């Protein structure tokens, strides 16, 4: 009884072989990927709060969040 | 009884072989990846709070968060 | 009874072989990766709080956090 | 010039107050949460490999992983 | 100038107060949480390899891993 | 100039007060939490390798790991 498994990359006359090899030359920058699984929760995810009150502000409110 | 497993990369006449080898030449900067699993929770994730009150502010409120 | 396992990278006439070898030449700076598993919790993760009250601020509030 | 900040929980005639206090009476067991940020990598995450060859096995292969 | 900050929990006639106090009565056992940030890497994370060859095994292979 | 800061828990007629106090009565046993940050690395994390060759095994291989 005989079994053969072969995985082959074969080149004559001089060129590159890339075998099971991830190559990343480009710049990689995914931004703001939110994966959320929530039950019964109060979640602020990727949800920054910016408030500015400035230059002669009276009797005034910024209300943010939950 | 016979078995052969072969994994081969073969080049005649002089060039690169990259075999099972991760190559990263590019710049890597993923930003703000939030993965959240929340049950019954009060979560602020990746959610900075900035408040400025400045230059003649009276009787005034910034309300942020939870 | 016979077994042969071969994993082979072969080049004639002189060039690079990279075998099972991580190569990182690029700059690496992933930023703000938040992984959160929360049950029944009050979690501030990657959620800094900055408050400035400055230059004639009276009877005023920045409320942030929990 | 006056400011008053109040957070109040008030009870007449005898009952529990739970204030900013996480309470977990249930059993907590999240299983197999994989968070993966990958660039140019060979990653096996949460990916066990089980191989059994048993009881009269001849000239045979189990091939797993990357 | 006057400022008052109050955080109050008040009960008449005898009962529990839980204030800024985490309470965990349940059994806590999260399992197999993998958080992975990978660049240009060969990572086996939470990925055990089990191989059994047993009871009359001839000319045979379990190949696992990388 | 006047400032008052109060944090108060008050009960009339005798019962428990838990103030800024972690209470853990449950059994705590998180298992197999892997946090991995990898650049240019060959990492086996929480990835044990078990190989058994037993009871009439001939010309046979378990290959695991790297």
Nearest CA-CA distance, residue B16 and chain C, Å: 5
Sequence-distant (≥ 6) Cβ neighbours of residue D24 within 8 angstroms? B40, C39, C40, E23, E24, E25, E26, E28, F26
**Which of D2, D30, D37 faces C33 most closely, judged by CB atoms?**
D37
Q: Residue D13: is it exposed, middle or buried by C-beta count within 10 angstroms (0-12/13-18/19+)?
A: exposed
Tokens of C35: 């992984």
Resolution expressed in Å = 1.9
Does residue D66 contact residue A9 with C-beta atoms inside 8 Å? no
- Sign of the dihedral defined by the CA atoms of residues D11, D14, D19, D22, in that order: negative
Which residues in chain C are contacts of F40 at CB distance < 8 A? 22-24
Q: How was this structure determined?
A: cryo-EM
Tokens of D25: 């009476």
For B45, nearest residue in chain C (alpha carbons): C45
Tokens of B63: 């309300």
**Neighbour tally for D11: CB within 10 Å:** 16
Residue whose tokens read 């992984």:
C35
């Amino acid at each position: 009884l005989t079994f053969r498994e072969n995985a082959k990359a074969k080149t004559d006359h001089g060129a590159e072989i890339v075998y099971k090899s991830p190559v990343v030359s480009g710049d990689t920058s995914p931004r703001h990927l939110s994966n959320v699984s929530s039950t019964g929760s109060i979640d602020m995810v990727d949800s920054p709060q910016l408030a500015t009150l400035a230059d002669e502000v009276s009797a005034s409110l910024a209300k943010q969040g939950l």
